[PDB]
Amino acid sequence: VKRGSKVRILRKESYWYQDIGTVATIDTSGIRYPVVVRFEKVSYSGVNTNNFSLDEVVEV
Amino acid sequence: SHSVKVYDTCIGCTQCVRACPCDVLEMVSWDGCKAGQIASAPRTEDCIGCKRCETACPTDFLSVRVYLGGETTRSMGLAY
Amino acid sequence: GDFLIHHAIALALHTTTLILVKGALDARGSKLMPDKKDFGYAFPCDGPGRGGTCDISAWDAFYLSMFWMLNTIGWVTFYWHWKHITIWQGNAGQFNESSTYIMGWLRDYLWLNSSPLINGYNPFGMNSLSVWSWMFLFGHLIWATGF
Amino acid sequence: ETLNLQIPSPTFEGSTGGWLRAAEVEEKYAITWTSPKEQVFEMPTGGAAIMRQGENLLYLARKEQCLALATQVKNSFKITDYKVYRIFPSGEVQYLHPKDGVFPEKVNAGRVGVGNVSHSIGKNLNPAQIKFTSKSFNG
Amino acid sequence: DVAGLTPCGESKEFARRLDGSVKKLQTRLSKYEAGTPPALALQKQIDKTKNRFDRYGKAGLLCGTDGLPHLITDGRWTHSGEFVIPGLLFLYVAGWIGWVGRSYVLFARTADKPTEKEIIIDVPVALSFVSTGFIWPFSAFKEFTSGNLIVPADEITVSPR
Amino acid sequence: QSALYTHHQYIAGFLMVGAFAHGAIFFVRDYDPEQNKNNVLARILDHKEAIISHLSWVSLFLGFHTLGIYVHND
Amino acid sequence: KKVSITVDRDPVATSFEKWAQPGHFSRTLAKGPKTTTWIWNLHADVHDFDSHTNSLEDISRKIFSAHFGQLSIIFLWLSGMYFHGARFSNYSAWLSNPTAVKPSAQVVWPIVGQEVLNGDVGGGFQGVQVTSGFFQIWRSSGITSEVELYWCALAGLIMSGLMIFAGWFHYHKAAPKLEWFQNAESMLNHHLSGLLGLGCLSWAGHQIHVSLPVNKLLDAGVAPQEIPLPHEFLVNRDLMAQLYPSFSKGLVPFFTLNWSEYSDFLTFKGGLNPVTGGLWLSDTAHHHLALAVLFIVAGHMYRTNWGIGHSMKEILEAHKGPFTGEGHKGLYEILTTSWHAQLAINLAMLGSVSIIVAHHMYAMPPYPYIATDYPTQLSIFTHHMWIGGFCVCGGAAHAGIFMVRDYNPAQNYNNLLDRVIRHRDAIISHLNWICIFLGFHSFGLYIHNDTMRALGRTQDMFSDTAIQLKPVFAQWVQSIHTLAPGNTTPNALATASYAFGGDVVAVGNKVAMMPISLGTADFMVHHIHAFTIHVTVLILLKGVLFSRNSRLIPDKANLGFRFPCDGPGRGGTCQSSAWDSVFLGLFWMYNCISVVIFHFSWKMQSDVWGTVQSDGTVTHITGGNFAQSAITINGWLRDFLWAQASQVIQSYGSALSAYGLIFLGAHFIWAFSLMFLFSGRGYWQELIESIVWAHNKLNVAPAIQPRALSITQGRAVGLAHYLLGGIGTTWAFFLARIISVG
Ligand code: CLA
Ligand code: CLA
Ligand code: CLA
Ligand code: CLA
Ligand code: CLA
Ligand code: CLA
Ligand code: CLA
Ligand SMILES: CC1=CCCC(C)(C)[C@H]1/C=C/C(C)=C/C=C/C(C)=C/C=C/C=C(C)/C=C/C=C(C)/C=C/C1=C(C)CCCC1(C)C
Ligand code: SF4
DSSP: OOTTOEEEEOOTTSTTTTOEEEEEEEOOSSOSSOEEEEOSSOOTTSOOEEEEOGGGEEEO | OOEEEEETTOOOOOHHHHHOTTOOOEEEEOSSSTTSEEEEOTTGGGOOOOOHHHHHOOSSSOSEEEEOOOOOTTTTTOOO | OHHHHHHHHHHHHHHHHHHHHHHHHTSSOOSSOTTGGGTOSOOOOSOSGGGOOTTOSHHHHHHHHHHHHHHHHHHHHHHHHHHHHHHHHTOHHHHHHHTTSHHHHIIIIIIHHHHHHHTSEETTEEOTTHHHHHHHHHHHHHHHHHO | OOOOTTOOOOBOOOOTTSOOHHHHHTOEEEEEEEESSOEEEEOTTSSEEEEOSEEEEEEESSHHHHHHHHHHHHHHSOOOOOEEEEEOTTSOEEEEESTTSSOTTSOOTTOOOOSEESSOGGGOOOTTTTTTSOOOSOO | OGGGOEETTTOHHHHHHHHHHHHHHHHHHTTSOTTSHHHHHHHHHHHHHHHHHHHHHTTTOEEOTTSOEEOOOSSOGGGTTTTHHHHHHHHHHHHHHHHHHHHHHHHHHTSSSTTHHHHSOOHHHHHHHHHGGGGHHHHHHHHHHTTOSSOOGGGSOOOOO | OHHHHHHHHHHHHHHHHHHHHHHHHIIIIIOOTTTTTTSHHHHHHHTHHHHHHHHHHHHHHHHHHHHHHHHHHO | OOSOOOEEESOSOOOSTGGGSTTTTSTTGGGOOSBTHHHHHHHHTTTOGGGTOSOHHHHHHHHHHHHHHHHHHHHHHHHHHHHHHHHSOOHHHHHHOTTTSOOEEEOOOOSSSGGGGSEEOSSSOEEEEOOSOHHHHHHHHTOOSHHHHHHHHHHHHHHHHHHHHHHHIIIIIEEEOHHHHOOHHHHHHIIIIIIIIHHHHHHHHHIIIIIHHHHHHHHHTOOGGGSOOHHHHHHOHHHHHHHOGGGGGTTHHHHTTOGGGGGGTSOOOOSBOTTTSSBOHHHHHHHHHHHHHHHHHHTTSBOSSSSOSBOHHHHHHHOOOSSSTTTTTTHHHHHTTOHHHHHHHHHHHHHHHHHHHHHHHHHSOOSTTOSSOHHHHHHHHHHHHHHHHHHHHHHHHHHHHIIIIIOOGGGOSSSHHHHHHTTHHHHHHHHHHHHHHHHHHHHHHHHHHHHHHHTTOGGGSBSSSSBOOOOHHHHHHHHHHHHOBTTTBTTOSSOSOGGGSSOOEEETTEEEEOOOOOOHHHHHHHHHHHHHHHHHHHHHHHHHHTSSOOSSOTTHHHHOSSOSOSOSOTTOOTTOSSHHHHHHHHHHHHHHHHHHHHHHHHHHHHHTOEEEOTTSOEEESSOSOHHHHTTSHHHIIIIIIIHHTHHHHTTTTSTTHHHHHHHHHHHHHHHHHHHHHHOOHHHHHHHHHHHHHHHHHTTOOOSSBOOOOOHHHHHHHHHHHHHHHHHHHHHHHHHHHHHHHO
8 A cells, every 4th residue: 555545454353344544654664564544433442543464454 | 370462463562561560561672563672471470460451552452462360369469 | 911011022032132142143252352252251351441341251141131031031921920810810801901001010910919928927827828928038138139 | 689678667657458467478578669758658558658768668468569659659759769579488589570670661682572472363263273172272 | 893892982881981081070070169270170171081082982993892992003904094104104204313314424424523513513404404304215215226325244344253 | 820831931031041152152162163164154143233233123123112102001 | 817808800701612612621521522432421520620620729619609500509499499389389278277288389281181190189279299398388487478479489589690690700700719718717607607697596586576476376376368467577566565475575685684584485395386286486486596696606716817716727636645646637738628528528417417307307397287297297308318318428429539539648647547547457347247247136137037927936036025125225215305394404394306205296186296116126127227327337438448549459549539440350350449339338328218218107107197086096097017017027018018009009090190100110210220230331332333333334323433331330320220210119109108198
């Protein structure tokens, strides 16, 4: 993906699994979960952002 | 004792380690997150099972997971 | 009166089914505990985080449906017994008129039929219904201690 | 390193909240810290005590009681000089916290990671797969 | 008649219901003087009670052995005014409320602060929506067939299982 | 006649709860989703929110109006 | 003059802007909702001022103006009580026949058949019978006409407008500074002397010049419109000297200290007026005059601006002995810097006074014709027992909020608080033992009796007939009070109350008061009371003493006053907060006050209330069944709950059908509460998920994401509906029962 794009989450235990977020940053370093995605819904913990990997994220 | 696990989704925020009332958790060096550090559970015999670490954790599903197990004098928090 | 109680019994069958089906289908996971299957069938909670997780286990839906099972068999057996005791007297019209509102169930079934039971002993003597009169109070005591 | 048993104790008038027979037959915990002042603090087990200027020493029944005091002593009196010990009735004194001289929330070399699972939490094994098998659910 | 019931206009038990209801009011009226406010209040209640019993008798309702009206709800047209037409009236209002509430929640999603529109309602826009509800059956079905009522299963968050 | 009816309906309600409880114990403990790919069992779990919300509607539907008529009558 | 008035002028701007911004008062809530929890958190924390602001000055200002708002509501409430008496009541008909007409000041509209509630209360009137005792107050006041009730209604409305103006004015225009609120000596001097002292003195003046002449003419038998207006007693001193000849001498006997001249209207009679069954109003006038003097005297104790007076700090710091360390040192600083510590004391005392009011008003009936109005006697006893029990539990609620928040160990070293917290295990273990002993030896006596009566062994029961547990100490105290007139209260003519012994006072052939004998059943239920009060103290004291820390949670003060738990570890710490002991102690308060009002209701019907006829014998409402049937639980179930629930169940189709509906409705609310009490939040959030899914399917999900209620709010909602349901059931049962038979 690229920064600022809209993505549909594919991590089955995510709060936002099959919901749309927007990509904040992507880390070039060897990070296991380099895609930073922000959402408009908060999770049950009140967090509105999470890190993801490329194989857990699809552009819409 | 209780079983406390740290999954590789840990962003190294150290919040679980600061919230732990029994010094169960500490930070060890890593290279899988930007912070360069991951939570660790070297002293789970002292874990009382409060799950204050899980409350502190900000990853979408908890990087730190407490699994309540056999009860002891330490994990039952008995001063008697 | 029979129409109304059957729809109450239908309400209680679908609501008991709801708690139990929700317990069976959310047993493996939910959105609060997506890894609920790692913890077993009967665990207390996942702690106060994520808003609070009291009664989140699949066992706890057994626990909650047990109250609804007791409520439904109450509605079934209250109906069976009142419909039969009024017929056995020869006064089926007492059920026919009083079952359509809830005060008819309270006064013409529970309050009216209580009197031989609660007079099994009194300051004037006792009879052989004294044991059921004692089990009656005994049952109210165990029930309240559960609270 | 070892607990100097002779360190004076904070002026306290006693309480019923202190340790019971399990401390003298199973284990006891101690906390030491340096105070720049002769000031009142709150005991985890009850009322208020006064820590003496210099080195203080307490005995508590639970490890959490020593750390709850350590949290308070560092948040209101900015004492970061606290060392927590475990004491067995055999006389053995076991240093506890901070375990390697550095606080746990700060990284340190030579710390080996315990409990770390290489996958995310959703990648565990289903219970049916490991039934009548010793294999662990973490992959 | 239907299910062994009797039309309320010829039920003798319905007739005794009306009489007992009026005797109960007349004995309360026997304790007041003619022009008093308690006498006028009870005389108006005897008029209301008689009117209700007269209307029920002439309406085609069926009475039981207990002398009370019974409702037939199996779908027959001679009895559609007891459930089917009140039900048709209900569903029109209920779908109206549902269509109007749904239209406002979709509007509020496109707002500057979507959750402020739900605790502080934009009353001119929310009144624009309430007026639209009169043709909800046509508006909602066209919404359905145009692929805008139902979202596909793969844009809905579900539990891992 | 009264005791026998009451006895066996209470036995029935306990047995019915236990079946659903042990169905819950089955899914947690004994159900393997990979030996059940696209079964009737797996497809149940695939639309569990459809099942649970429609029980929720029918319970509320029955409850609002059954209690509502009774309160109206009272 | 260090006691001075200091005010900030125009502090806060009168703007509608913050009205449009719900949640403006806290930093968390002011950024808007994202889940439905925000909506509940908005109402939960709104009057928690010391949770929004750091400064004690702004907190004190919000409290002072909110107390004016409360006063405005009470005055509006009082004004409406007078207006309904003036406009929609049978008051004037009741004045002619107090023993025949039933008070009624509420008339319903005819809408859905609900006009059946306008029952025949008497006096050519239809309405809802009222039991608040206003009619008896108004006759005691000397109102005698609806015209004067309209003027009282306007007087309440003018006061209601003035209080809401003052609350606005003192928050927005002229707000006092913290040094104004921190004048405890000045406030006590004025509230003893000015509020309570001039309150009693002025009311004594109304009683002497208006209540005494008007009520003497009424009890002589003069018709209400035949009675001179209250100012003609003020001017025509000859007319006042007809009724009370001491007025011929005026105020010379007062000033020259020849007070015995005033014995016409300042009596010490005791007992009841035979005509009305109420207290002699000449006694109440002397009571209020004497109370007024020593409230004005008491309000000169403390030092303000001239060197005379006590320093309250000096009094407290001097009271210290060898057991109690530094003593009461530091308590002045607590009570002039913590509003919660002040509210904890004042709620516990106000609750205690409300419980005392319930006992004193049934036993020494103060108003004319209130003793034989049994619906009022039962209503105001039951109402003031509940107000007392609720206010007592809020005293421990705010003692906990003080300890968690306003308590500072540095300023409380070795004083009485420090010492209480440092032996709280000894307090809670000894109270715990007393409650086990009390429960076994009060309720177990009932269980012994249930079993023996069921087993056919009536000789083995604790009864007046069998083994006797007599209350000799209560019987002895009753003996002393009957002997007191002429002996240890020599100038009294009658006893303080006929409940202690003496005559039967009958008004309109109904018993006003008569000796309330104490037997084994009275011994048993009094120890039932001591058990339920001690357990309530146990739950609430344990919450206050362990609010900051336990052996379980060493840092409970960091979690706050109100937290649901500290996790499932340590075996489980569910309901470990100080809030959760108030939650558990309101159930045991409910249990306690329910037995008190049941004891009162059954005893008064069985042994006191009823009808007198020839041979002077009294036929009581339930015929004296208390002695031999209140000793078993089956007796309370059968002869009290079952026997007396007949009126509320058979009430349909009458004017009491409203009580029949509220009986069922409250049974519903009570049961519905158990959904919230026995369940947990985790079930309800997962159920909401499937409901959210069906909304997502139809694209109608809300932007304020629905949540299950918090763990605490589930406890608060469960307790509130339990109390609403439990108390509402008894309210209908009490009111339909006593209106029908009493
Ligand atoms: C404070 C206590 C109190 C109480 C409990 C009552 C209770 C009652 N009064 Mg009494 N009354 C009172 C004070 C009180 N009154 C006072 C002080 C006066 C003198 C002005 C009166 C004068 C009075 C008269 C003259 C009458 C009553 C009547 C009634 C009855 C029906 C009222 C009704 O449905 O009107 C409802 C009227 C409406 C206009 C409905 C308004 C509903 C709105 C929506 C409430 C909303 C409040 C609002 C949202 C608050 C927020 C403000 C906003 C800016 C957000 C009821 C028994 C009637 C009666 O007994 O008839 C036999 C009657 O005729 N009252
Ligand atoms: C003689 C002096 C005096 C009197 C009567 C009062 C009376 C009162 N004060 Mg106090 N107060 C005083 C001096 C006085 N104060 C001083 C000197 C201070 C500064 C240290 C305070 C500081 C203070 C605080 C901080 C608070 C009060 C509160 C209250 C009210 C308590 C609630 C209550 O019972 O009201 C109901 C009883 C009544 C009798 C209602 C009466 C209403 C008016 C104001 C009473 C006086 C009217 C007037 C003097 C009488 C004229 C008589 C004329 C017809 C001949 C009450 C009105 C509390 C309150 O509720 O705030 C509003 C509160 O929070 N006062
Ligand atoms: C108008 C808005 C709206 C719409 C279209 C729906 C639509 C639906 N809801 Mg409901 N719901 C709503 C509001 C709404 N909901 C609110 C406010 C709540 C909180 C009480 C709920 C609570 C709720 C539950 C608990 C359940 C549903 C269910 C359902 C489904 C079946 C219909 C039903 O059972 O109704 C039931 C409706 C209620 C129980 C409450 C409705 C209360 C009012 C009447 C609606 C709100 C009016 C709103 C203020 C509109 C203002 C518009 C204005 C600003 C222009 C359907 C998806 C059920 C489901 O999932 O089954 C498949 C189900 O179990 N909903
Ligand atoms: C009398 C007691 C009572 C009542 C009424 C309920 C009612 C309900 N329960 Mg609960 N429950 C109870 C006891 C009770 N329960 C107990 C003791 C337990 C054991 C802990 C449970 C455990 C339990 C579980 C575990 C579940 C339920 C469910 C349900 C629902 C099933 C019936 C239904 O779906 O529609 C009936 C609907 C109603 C009865 C609502 C009444 C309509 C209200 C009163 C409208 C009135 C509005 C009025 C103006 C409000 C005035 C407020 C005032 C301040 C102005 C319903 C909300 C299930 C559920 O939520 O599924 C959807 C569910 O999963 N209950
Ligand atoms: C929610 C609160 C609440 C409500 C709705 C009521 C409602 C009622 N009360 Mg109760 N009351 C309450 C709380 C409440 N009370 C508390 C907390 C107390 C303890 C102080 C009392 C003490 C009380 C008494 C002593 C009397 C009532 C009476 C009444 C009734 C007539 C109302 C009236 O005009 O008062 C009229 C009140 C009077 C005419 C006399 C009041 C005399 C007291 C001593 C004045 C004290 C004022 C002072 C500022 C308070 C100081 C408190 C102290 C701790 C320092 C009505 C049923 C009267 C009643 O039952 O009549 C049938 C009655 O005589 N109340
Ligand atoms: C003079 C009396 C007084 C005062 C000033 C206060 C003031 C306060 N209390 Mg205390 N309290 C009191 C009496 C008092 N309380 C009593 C008598 C009790 C015993 C029940 C308590 C128990 C108590 C607890 C347990 C707590 C407080 C808290 C608070 C604070 C927050 C208030 C708030 O935001 O609530 C907002 C108000 C509401 C949400 C109102 C809803 C409450 C009920 C459910 C509605 C009322 C039902 C109604 C009467 C009947 C309905 C009729 C029905 C048929 C429809 C505030 C400092 C809280 C706190 O954190 O303080 C720091 C807290 O946790 N209080
Ligand atoms: C009927 C219901 C019931 C009963 C019996 C109890 C019983 C008790 N509660 Mg509980 N409680 C209840 C409902 C009940 N509660 C509810 C609904 C709540 C909800 C809020 C609570 C909340 C609560 C709290 C928060 C507290 C209690 C406390 C207590 C104890 C009071 C001390 C006492 O009386 O010891 C005596 C014991 C009894 C009276 C129990 C009955 C025993 C009788 C005499 C017969 C004994 C028969 C004998 C043992 C037979 C032996 C042979 C047999 C084994 C074969 C006691 C264990 C308090 C406590 O534990 O402190 C001491 C306390 O702090 N309760
Ligand atoms: C939770 C759970 C998880 C997974 C595993 C699990 C254990 C399987 C599960 C549990 C599931 C559970 C507990 C499931 C419980 C399932 C139950 C109780 C099913 C009831 C079935 C009854 C039927 C089909 C009656 C049919 C009658 C008919 C057709 C009569 C017809 C007629 C005749 C012949 C005569 C009259 C005329 C008519 C009316 C025409
Ligand atoms: S209150 Fe609920 S979340 Fe907290 S420990 Fe108890 S069960 Fe778990």
